[PDB]
């Protein structure tokens, strides 16, 4: 489509006007409402305008991008209270959201690649500009050099596919099939880094911690899903070779999910534990993607949609304790039930959404993902039970130790909870239970 | 200017005497006087006064719009049974009306607009056969449906197509 | 404000062993008369033994510690309101500065209490300037 | 501060909402407008739109066509579900000498 793109393009001059910070998120929620209205999509590409079109996977990912960026302007009031550069922050957020909409509504592989690697420069700018740590240089360089080092040979793979086929469109490239090892490694390993593996994760827990709240939303909300969207577009023509080489990645992802779930029990930071928590769920997503079933692909799309909300909502919760208690340390964050009792509703409602929860879309994504992985092999029942047990062994630890117990002595006086924060964590959880209603929307993209 | 703390400076007052173990290791008599003054300060004689501004700010006009006639019902019964015995019969009138409204709406929905063969998302009701004992009409009884098309029809046998 | 010192005397060690032995004896024998009879028996066992020297007392103190570790009850009786009990610190009292973060309309419900708190704030800041200032 | 100052609070001592910390006018406007663009547009009117959304996916049409097809297939009685994509007489299979050593997958 072009309406949303030109809406953000004409929302670009809102940044240069003084005292215009809160109108931009109003117009962003308005264009999210308009994007809720334009929902006539089926499994093929619809609303074809030049090189821009949309199917159901692209619809869900653009809607998630708009919701995460609209809440990202709502979460960052620390940028508005200080005289930190609001115009540059708004311009970077609008440009980054426009690049995410352009790389998700891309009809072809190459424009997807171009806006996909254009998206990492505003994330770089947010991490090195608006963070609160001395190691922001260690944060952005790890992210950029990891993704760039594994995504440069993907361009050689992309033009090898173009030279063998002729076209760049997803449907015409779905017809062909390749039997090459190095083409498979080029077109897969960039997404295998962009979603967290066990071995290649390092950029993730050292880039989530040192970023701002907005870097945390944009990294754990939609930029762990660029790799998932890319693998959902690439795996269709590399089925024979991924069936040869998928047991290595699935075994590494499952053992790495168990091991990173064992890491989070030995983590002393709130923002680092959610950073490693993004590794464990996307390990289940990666293990269910390579089985190529209908249920694996549908449950992977459902779990990426339901994870981009819940991980970002958990990252807003660690920010509103970092703003008041002064540190992200888990030892300091103790007994917040007696400090902010009304926040503890949103802590447990968004920590339960990280595990299997009764009304959330995360359970409907996790059920449809464990179906495919148990269907893939019977040996995976040993390590899926361990991973899904350790997931709530660590995820209950963050709510339990931060929101229950004796109070941390020697804490100075801070402000109380605000209606903006309650609204911010309201919109990270009510989409998770209102989307099981009309769940055939957000699951059946095929 | 925006004051989050109401215009007064926030600080601790009772000090180190709030812990039970710090109370027992030793007290200077000025700390004994401070703890006694804090315990006499923490007592309250009368209850909280009914601030009308809290009721004004903590109630939207829609809430007053849909709670006005039951408030009139509670106010016209206020001198008859007192405040406590009239708010109870006011609160169990509107809640009973809501319960009967929900019962009537659910009854209307599950017996007049249940799930049929033209829609997936409705509530698809399946009923079992009632037990027939003698004294009922037609005790020699077999299963009425026997065809495979009669099972789980969801109103397909009355389709116009 | 006397912070306790970590050195423990030998008489303090045998007094702590006597206290823990009678607490274990109270845990083992629930009836008060049988516990009293066994407590007088254990007191006579200690009182026949207090006339020895220091090194023999240290070695037999270690033997008594090993014996008390051997005969320790699986469910020792403890007071509920004290530390380590069944219902220790069931409620956690937050510090009073959150009372300073109430709404003024919420502060209007206890205006005499908040006026007394605002009066006590000046006394506390002069007391803190006297003590640590 | 005294007892009558807390009993009647000053209107200038106002507790801010989360949106602005400079003046009271920008708090109320941004609070009411942000609650307008999220709750009564993106969660209630949008959910009402998505409740009465038409058959974008053809799941209702699939159920109606399945009921009509199961009405008509068991009347003919050939197959409730057809196992073959095309007719077995229409497909021209290659001969055994034509294939040679080719990987036949089943």
């Amino acid at each position: 489509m072009l309406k949303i793109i030109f809406f953000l393009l004409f929302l670009i001059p809102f940044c240069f006007i003084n005292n215009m910070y809160w109108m931009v998120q109003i117009m962003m929620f308005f264009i999210s409402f308009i994007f809720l209205l334009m929902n006539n999509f089926m499994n093929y590409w619809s609303e074809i305008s030049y090189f821009l079109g949309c199917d159901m996977l692209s619809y869900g990912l653009i809607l998630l991008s708009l919701w995460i960026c609209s809440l990202m302007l709502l979460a960052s009031e620390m940028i508005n209270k200080h005289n930190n550069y609001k115009n540059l922050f708004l311009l970077n957020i609008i440009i980054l959201l426009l690049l995410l909409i352009l790389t998700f509504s891309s009809m072809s592989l190459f424009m997807f690649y171009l806006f996909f690697e254009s998206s990492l420069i505003p994330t770089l700018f947010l991490i090195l500009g608006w963070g609160y740590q001395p190691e922001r240089l260690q944060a952005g360089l790890y992210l950029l050099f990891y993704t760039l080092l594994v995504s440069l040979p993907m361009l050689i793979g992309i033009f090898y596919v173009m030279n063998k086929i002729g076209s760049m469109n997803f449907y015409l490239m779905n017809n062909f099939m390749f039997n090459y090892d190095l083409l498979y490694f080029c077109l897969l390993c960039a997404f295998l880094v962009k979603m967290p593996m066990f071995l290649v994760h390092l950029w993730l827990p050292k880039a989530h911690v040192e970023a701002p709240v907005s870097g945390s939303m944009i990294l754990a909300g939609i930029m762990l899903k660029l790799g998932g969207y890319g693998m959902l577009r690439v795996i269709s023509f590399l089925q024979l070779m991924n069936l040869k080489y998928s047991f290595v990645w699935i075994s590494i992802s499952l053992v790495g999910g168990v091991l990173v779930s064992l890491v989070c029990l030995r983590q002393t930071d709130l923002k680092a534990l959610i950073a490693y928590s993004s590794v464990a769920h996307m390990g289940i997503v990666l293990s269910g993607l390579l089985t190529m079933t209908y249920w694996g692909l549908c449950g992977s799309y459902t779990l990426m949609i339901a994870h981009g909300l819940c991980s970002s909502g958990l990252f807003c919760l660690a920010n509103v304790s970092y703003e008041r208690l002064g540190s992200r340390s888990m030892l300091i964050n103790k007994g917040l039930l007696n400090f902010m009792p009304s926040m503890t509703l949103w802590w447990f409602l968004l920590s339960s959404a990280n595990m299997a929860a009764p009304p959330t879309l995360n359970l409907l994504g996790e059920i449809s993902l464990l179906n495919s992985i148990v269907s893939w092999s019977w040996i995976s029942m040993i390590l899926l039970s361990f991973l899904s047990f350790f997931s709530a062994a660590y995820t209950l630890y963050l709510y339990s130790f931060s929101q229950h117990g004796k109070l941390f002595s020697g804490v100075y006086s801070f402000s109380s909870g605000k209606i903006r924060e309650y609204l911010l964590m309201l919109l990270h959880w009510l989409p998770l239970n209102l989307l099981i209603l009309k769940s055939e929307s957000f699951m059946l993209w095929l | 200017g925006a004051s989050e703390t109401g215009g007064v400076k926030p600080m601790v007052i009772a000090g180190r005497m709030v812990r039970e173990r710090e109370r027992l290791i030793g007290m200077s008599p000025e700390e004994r006087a401070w703890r006694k003054q804090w315990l006499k300060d923490q007592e309250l004689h009368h209850g909280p006064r009914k601030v009308p501004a809290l009721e004004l700010e903590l109630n939207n006009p829609i809430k007053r719009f849909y709670r006005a006639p039951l408030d009139k019902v509670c106010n016209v019964l206020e001198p008859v049974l007192g405040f406590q015995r009239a708010y109870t019969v006011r609160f169990w009138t509107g809640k009973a009306l809501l319960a009967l409204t929900g019962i009537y709406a659910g009854a209307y929905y599950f017996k007049y607009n249940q799930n049929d063969w033209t829609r997936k998302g409705g509530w698809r009701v399946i009923h079992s056969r009632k037990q027939c004992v003698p004294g009922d009409e037609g005790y020699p009884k077999v299963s009425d449906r026997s065809a495979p098309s009669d099972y789980a029809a969801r109103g397909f046998n009355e389709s116009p197509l | 404000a006397q912070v306790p010192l970590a050195i423990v005397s030998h008489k303090r060690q045998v007094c702590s062993l006597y206290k823990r032995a009678l607490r274990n004896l109270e845990s083992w024998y629930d009836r008060r008369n049988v516990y009293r009879y066994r407590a007088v028996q254990l007191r006579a066992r200690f009182d026949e033994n207090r006339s020895k020297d220091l090194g023999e007392g240290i070695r037999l103190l270690a033997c008594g510690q090993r014996e008390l570790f051997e005969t320790r009850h699986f469910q020792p009786r403890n007071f509920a309101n004290s530390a380590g009990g069944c219902a220790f610190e069931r409620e956690v009292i937050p510090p009073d500065w959150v009372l300073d973060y109430w709404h003024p309309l919420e502060k209007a419900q206890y205006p005499e209490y908040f006026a007394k708190r605002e009066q006590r704030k000046k006394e506390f800041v002069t007391w803190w300037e006297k003590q640590y200032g | 501060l005294t007892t009558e100052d807390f009993a009647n609070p000053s209107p200038k001592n106002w507790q801010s909402y989360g949106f602005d910390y400079k003046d009271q006018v920008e708090d109320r406007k941004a609070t009411k407008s942000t609650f307008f663009v999220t709750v009564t547009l993106c969660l209630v009117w949008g959910s009402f739109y998505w409740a009465y959304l038409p058959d974008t996916q053809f799941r209702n049409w699939a159920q109606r066509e399945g009921f009509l097809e199961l009405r008509r297939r068991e009347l003919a009685g050939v197959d409730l579900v057809s196992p073959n994509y095309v007719d077995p007489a229409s497909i021209t299979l290659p001969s055994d000498e034509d294939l040679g050593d080719t990987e036949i997958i089943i």
Binding site: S416, Y422 | - | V98, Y101, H103 | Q15
Partner: peptide, 19 residues
Amino acid sequence: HQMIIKPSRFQWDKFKDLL
């Protein structure tokens, strides 16, 4: 009647009424 030391619940109630 001792006065319990509770944090402020005005903002949560105003959020509930606005919602």
